[PDB]
């Protein structure tokens, strides 16, 4: 996260760390959506152009964390993956269309002060909140600058951007399964996701029922925190029938 700040303890209890065991390194962010399901970006698990193709036994998840590196006794919980489900129409060849994947934990995780699932949006929540200028929150342990790793989880709040401005900002083909967020050059404020933040959540707090909803997944950008560039996020609501189909058929 560039130009964010340290998260407060317990601020993002659905935050999940996807950890590669060998070599021992942060792979990506992710989010807890129930006691046995974790949501992330497909490209965190499968990206053939960069020879990336992980299977369930290559990774472990760490839940409840704050420190990037310290073992958090009696706070964090480690989980193994039973099965990964990548969206069958995820477009790795081109633009990361449908950049979404679900991971089933072998054993359910116990909730606590530090571990708790985020909501997925219903139709009214999505309609009421997915408006240009409305801010969401991005969290992760990714790099602090484009060219630098944080000691603890970082957080930044960023406004959703109008779709024509998103499209003008990039040479990539932008689909209805993506939205973009970030400040414009004229707005003064800064902030962005960066490498290592991929797969983590973009959340918004509903003023109607006080609950946090995951509206996006950190998907891709061009550099980090560049003027006139924006981060792109998977449009969770638009893919929510797939999420439910997977959980209903395989949960």
């Amino acid at each position: 996260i560039v130009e964010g700040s340290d998260a407060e303890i317990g601020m993002s209890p659905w935050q999940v760390m996807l950890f590669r065991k060998s070599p021992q390194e942060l792979l990506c962010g992710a989010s807890l959506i129930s006691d046995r399901w974790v949501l992330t970006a497909a490209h965190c698990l499968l990206y053939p152009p960069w020879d990336k193709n992980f299977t369930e036994n290559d990774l472990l998840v760490r839940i409840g964390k704050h420190s990037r590196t310290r073992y958090e006794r009696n706070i964090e919980k480690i989980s193994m993956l039973e099965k990964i489900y990548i969206h069958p129409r995820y477009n790795w060849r081109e633009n990361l269309d449908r950049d979404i994947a679900l991971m089933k934990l072998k054993k359910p995780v116990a909730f606590s002060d530090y571990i708790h699932p985020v909501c997925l949006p219903d139709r009214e929540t999505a309609a009421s909140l997915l408006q240009a200028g409305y801010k969401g929150r991005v969290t992760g342990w990714g790099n602090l600058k484009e060219t630098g790793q944080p000691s603890v989880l970082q957080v930044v709040n960023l406004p959703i951007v109008e779709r024509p401005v998103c499209k003008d900002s990039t040479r990539i083909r932008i689909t209805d399964n993506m939205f973009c967020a970030g400040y414009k050059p004229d707005e003064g404020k800064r902030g962005d996701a960066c490498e290592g933040d991929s797969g983590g959540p973009f959340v918004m707090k509903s003023p109607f029922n006080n609950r946090w909803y995951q509206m996006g997944i950190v998907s891709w950008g061009e550099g980090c925190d560049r003027d006139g560039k924006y981060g792109f996020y998977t449009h969770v609501f638009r893919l929510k029938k797939w999420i439910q189909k997977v959980i209903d058929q395989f949960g």
């Binding site: 490209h43 990206y47 152009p49 960069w50 129409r89 060849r93 081109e94 633009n95 990361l96 449908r98 139709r123 999505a126 309609a127 997915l130 408006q131 240009a132 200028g133 409305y134 484009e146 959703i160 951007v161 109008e162 779709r163 040479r171 990539i172 083909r173 209805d176 399964n177 993506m178 939205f179 996701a193 960066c194 490498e195 991929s198 891709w220 950008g221 061009e222 550099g223 980090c224 449009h235 609501f237 638009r238 893919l239 929510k240 029938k241 797939w242």
Partner: peptide, 26 residues
């Protein structure tokens, strides 16, 4: 105010790849 993303569902029924863009952040 303007919709940032469409309120509908992805259904069944090219362009430059991301990996060709210098400095692409995945």
């Amino acid at each position: 105010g303007e919709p940032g993303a469409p309120i509908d569902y992805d259904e069944y029924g090219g362009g430059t790849p991301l990996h060709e863009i210098p400095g692409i952040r995945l």
